[PDB]
Every structure is written in structure tokens, then in C-alpha cells.
Amino acid sequence: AYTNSFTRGVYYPDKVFRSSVLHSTQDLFLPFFSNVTWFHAIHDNPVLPFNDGVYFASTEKSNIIRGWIFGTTLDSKTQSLLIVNNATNVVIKVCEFQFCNDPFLGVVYSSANNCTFEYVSQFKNLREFVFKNIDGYFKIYSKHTPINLVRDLPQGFSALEPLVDLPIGINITRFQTLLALHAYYVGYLQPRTFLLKYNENGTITDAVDCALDPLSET
Amino acid sequence: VYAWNRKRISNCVADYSVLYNSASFSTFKCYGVSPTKLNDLCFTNVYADSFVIRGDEVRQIAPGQTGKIADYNYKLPDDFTGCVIAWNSNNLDSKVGGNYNYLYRLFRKSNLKPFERDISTEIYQAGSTPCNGVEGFNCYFPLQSYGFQPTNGVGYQPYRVVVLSFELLHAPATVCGPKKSTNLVKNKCVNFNFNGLTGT
Amino acid sequence: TNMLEALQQRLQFYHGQVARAALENNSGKARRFGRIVKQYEDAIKLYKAGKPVPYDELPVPPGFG
Amino acid sequence: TNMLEALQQRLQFYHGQVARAALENNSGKARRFGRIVKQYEDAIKLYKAGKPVPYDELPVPPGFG
Ligand SMILES: *[C@@H]1O[C@H](CO)[C@@H](O)[C@H](O)[C@H]1NC(C)=O
Ligand SMILES: *[C@@H]1O[C@H](CO)[C@@H](O)[C@H](O)[C@H]1NC(C)=O
Ligand SMILES: *[C@@H]1O[C@H](CO)[C@@H](O)[C@H](O)[C@H]1NC(C)=O
């Protein structure tokens, strides 16, 4: 199935405060009115390419969609990134794991060969995430505040503020989502150019894509 | 000697300030970097190797000067080894009976590759094949104790040696030394360096 | 092989069993075989010094050859 | 400090006395000083090479520490 992402997926590109100014930046963005592969896996989590960052969203307000495994070969040979929610601590393990056939998680482990790095941190809800990996830094953006502009569809405008930065410095090409044992979107982003509007506070209240429409280019 | 506990020193603000300033450390010799560069380069990850040897065997741990300990127990390549730290543990170790737990390997097939650990214990010599047992004209069980009784001289007194050889230039920096700070001023023409953001 | 080589090959077995005892972390028997090692060390030194060998009462391993 | 640093620190004194001999312009004791300087150079070279140490009859400077 396919779905149209109207204008979602705009994040703060840097840590610079601005106020009442229209700033145009060239960065990796998700173009407006694009196609996202609607996944509805219930009573089915295929491996998807990373392809220079991904978009992500969800709509279920309970702990069923938990983890995101990243890597290049999905085996103990190559370093593999893992992020899993425990509802009390977010565990991040970049250590090598062997192939997981039918991983079940919810609040799989084969072997931690050559373990090197670890990290520990802290209408329905929408969990929209943006994953980016540039120059050895893995950036994760998030926004856990849902807006019910329309029902059963993700329409509206919301900005994404950064949460964590990981200096892991690994090469990843494929990623997969982890579920339990018994509805998430995917979008790819290209190096577009946007014009963003700042409020009195340093909040982004409106953005304009400018490779989509001659009015927008104007 | 035959083994060593290698530990992951990462995600750290490592001072290196209390080190090299205290006189407890008998030998503090560094090769890759000059010992004075506390916040040197913000290197990527650190290796730490700890073991206990005799007094004389300290010179063999350094690159070159290969000896019995260096040949068959611990091989250090000729590279930018960070620093070598050694002190005397005659007070803590060296019971009146004599510590027998510390072991070293005198017989091995070939010199161990750099940073390769051999925990296995097995019969080595064979030759005439009387082996698969400790009794034999050529079996020569490899490990032998040290005998670190207090009456032994400083040459044979046990020394506790830690080899700090940090990893170099292989990933984005994760561990680095602390950054000095100072108080701030107001209403004066002062140039500033807020988190690397320079300006006047 | 005379007496020197026999005692030199003899003592290494006691070194090996001392090492095995240390691996077993039981230091009771380790002290006894360490005393045996020191006895054979001084025996070898005494033989090489050119003095009567006390081979009459020293303990015996399983095998002469 | 082991032995290496001690000899390396000793050799500087003898290079210094070589320098003073050169400045005072008599090459008599300068030759002897240079000979003992090369002797120490060989001493550090062999010690770093891992060879028997002739610290028994080599000349000594005023101070051990
Ligand atoms: C986070 O969850 C609990 C809270 O204490 C505890 O098991 C631990 O701190 C963390 N769990 C992990 C890391 O699996
Ligand atoms: C994985 O385990 C094997 C065990 O034989 C080891 O040789 C290898 O070094 C490990 N992987 C890494 C990346 O160290
Ligand atoms: C800015 O933040 C303040 C904080 O309470 C809020 O009251 C205000 O509505 C926000 N927007 C503007 C334009 O001030």
C-alpha cells in the first residue's frame, strides 16, 4: 500500500536560535507530498534499505513496535546497531549479533562477539522519527506529541527536535523493525532545499519546499 | 603474565592529571606521545593491559628489548604505545610463604603475535612422543611459578605493571581529556571561546 | 646422562605439578611440592659442587628410565 | 629509571667535559674523554639490544642518586 505524506517530516537542521526570520537552508529533507510505503503488519517486517536516512511514523499507543536494528550484513561478522525500549531505560547496543530469525520483543540474543560500545538513556499518539547518519555521527530526531487535525490520517504541520547523537562511526545500509510474539510508515529523504519560518520563540511554524511548484520556487 | 585483563576505556573524560604526578608509579615512560600532553589529541578508545611480573622483566615489556617474557607471553609491536606504568607490590603481594598463583610460560611453539592472548594450558615439547602425560623426558609442562617471597631482592620482587596503549585514529573521537574553564565577566570588551565558538 | 641431566629432568616434573596445584588454587599441597622443588634444587647444586649426593632418601617420581 | 635512563643521563656529563676540553683547546684529555664517551655509547647500545651488561669495570661518574 502507498500513502501521501502531505507536509510532515521537517526538523531543526542545527542548534541555532532564530526569531522572526525566514531562513533558507539546503539539507537532507523529506519532500512534500511524497509516497510512503504504508505497512499494516498484523494477523511481517521486511528488511528495508537505509538509503541516506529514513523517515518513520506510527499510530499505536502501546508497546508493540519496539526496536530498530541497523547494519549492513545482519550477522556477527559486521558491527550492528540495536535500539530497544524497556519502558524504563532505552538500551542501545552496537555490538555484533548473529542473525535473528523471528525476534520477539516487548516489555533473539545470540552472542555479543567483540562488544565495543553501549549506551543507556531514559485519537492516539504519533511517534514520528527521523534517522540520519553523516560523517560517522548517527542522529535521531523525534516528536511524541500527536495533533488530531484529521482522523485516521497524518495531516498537519509539526517540527522535529533532536534527541540523541551517537559517535559510533559505522556503515549501515539496511534496517528492520522489531515486533512481539502473538502500522508504521517509511519514507526516504533526498537533498532538497527548504525555506523555513521562525516564530518569536525559536520554533519552526511553517516551511516551504522549493523543488515542487513554480509558486514555491517563486 | 600469560593472561591479561583488557578493558574498554571509552565515553570518558580521562584526566591523565593524577597520573604521572604521583610518585607511587615507579616507571612512567611514554613512546607515541610526550608525557605532558594531558589533553593531547582526543584519541579514539583506550586499551589497558594489566599483569604482574618480576623486577627485571620490566625492560622487556617496552618495544624491542625482547626477552623470555616478551617472546612467549606478551608481544608489544613497535608502534605508538601510549605509556608504560609499573610499581612495586611487595606490600600487597608477596606473602611470607610466597605467592604461587602468578605464572609465566617458558615454552611455546612460536612468538605470540602482538596483542594475542593464550589462556590454553597444554603439553608442548613431545619430540619423542612420550607426552599426553606430565611424566616424560621431553614433555616439559609449560607453566612455572614465580616464588615471590619477601626475602627475594628487588630484582625478583613482584612488580605490578599496567600497559596503557590507547587506540589511534580509527573512528570519530569518543574519549578525550578535560577542557579547562574559567569564570565569566560582563560589561567589558573580552574575547570569548564558548564551546569552541570564538569571537570578541 | 650421568647424575646432572637426570636430576635436571627430574625437577621439572615437580615444577609442573606445583604449577598445576597453583591452577587448582589449593596452596596446601603446593607448599609441599615447593619444598620438594627446593630440596632438589639444593641437591643439584650440591652434586655440581662436587660433594656426596643425597640420592638415598630423596623422594622418587614414577620412572627411572 | 632502570639502567637505560641512568646511562643516558651519565653520558651527557662526559659530552660536556668533551666540550670543555675542546674550549680549553688542549686535545690531550679530549681524546680520553671521547674514548669513554664511545664506550658508554656502546654500553647503551648493547643494553638496549638486550645483551650482557658490563657495569662492573666501566668508569663511573661522581654520583649515583
Ligand atoms: C532499565 O530498566 C530497569 C530500570 O531500573 C533496569 O532493568 C535497568 O536499569 C534497565 N534495563 C536494562 C538495561 O535492560
Ligand atoms: C568474533 O569471534 C571470533 C572467535 O573466533 C574472533 O576471532 C573475532 O575476532 C570476533 N570478532 C571480532 C570483530 O573481533
Ligand atoms: C512563545 O512561548 C511562550 C511561552 O509561554 C508562549 O506564551 C507564546 O505563546 C509563544 N509564542 C509567541 C509568539 O510568543
Residue numbers in the entry:
A (entry chain B): 27 to 69, 80 to 143, 159 to 173, 186 to 245, 264 to 299
B (entry chain A): 350 to 549
C (entry chain D), D (entry chain h): 1 to 65
What does the study report here?
We applied our surface-centric approach to design de novo binders to target the SARS-CoV-2 RBD. We selected a site distinct from the ACE2-binding region, but overlapping such that a putative binder could inhibit the ACE2–RBD interaction. We next sought to improve the binding affinity of the design by generating two mutagenesis libraries: first, a directed library in the designed interface was prepared, which yielded DBR3_02 with four mutations and a dissociation constant (KD) of 4.6 µM determined by SPR. Second, we screened a site-saturation mutagenesis (SSM) library, which resulted in the enrichment of three point mutants, one of which overlapped with a mutation from the first library. Adding these three mutations to DBR3_02 resulted in DBR3_03, which showed a KD of 80 nM and was folded and stable. To structurally characterize the binding mode of DBR3_03, we solved a cryo-electron microscopy (cryo-EM) structure of the design in a complex with the trimeric spike protein at a local resolution of 2.9 Å. The structure confirmed the predicted binding sites on both partners. Importantly, the binder adopted the orientation of the helical binding seed that was marginally less favoured by MaSIF’s fingerprint descriptors (down orientation). Notably, the initial design DBR3_01 showed similar metrics when the interfaces were analysed in both directions, pointing to known limitations of surface fingerprints in the unbound docking type of problems. This led us to use another state-of-the-art protein docking method, AlphaFold Multimer26, to predict the complex of DBR3_03 with the spike RBD, and we obtained a 1.4 Å iRMSD between the AlphaFold prediction and the experimental structure. The designed interface lacks canonical hotspot residues and engages the RBD through small residues and is composed of 21% backbone and 79% side-chain contacts.
Here we use a geometric deep-learning framework operating on protein surfaces that generates fingerprints to describe geometric and chemical features that are critical to drive protein–protein interactions. As a proof of principle, we computationally designed several de novo protein binders to engage four protein targets: SARS-CoV-2 spike, PD-1, PD-L1 and CTLA-4. Guided by these general principles of molecular recognition, we introduce a protein design approach based on the critical importance of the fully buried patches of the interface to drive protein interactions. Overall, our surface-centric approach captures the physical and chemical determinants of molecular recognition, enabling an approach for the de novo design of protein interactions and, more broadly, of artificial proteins with function.
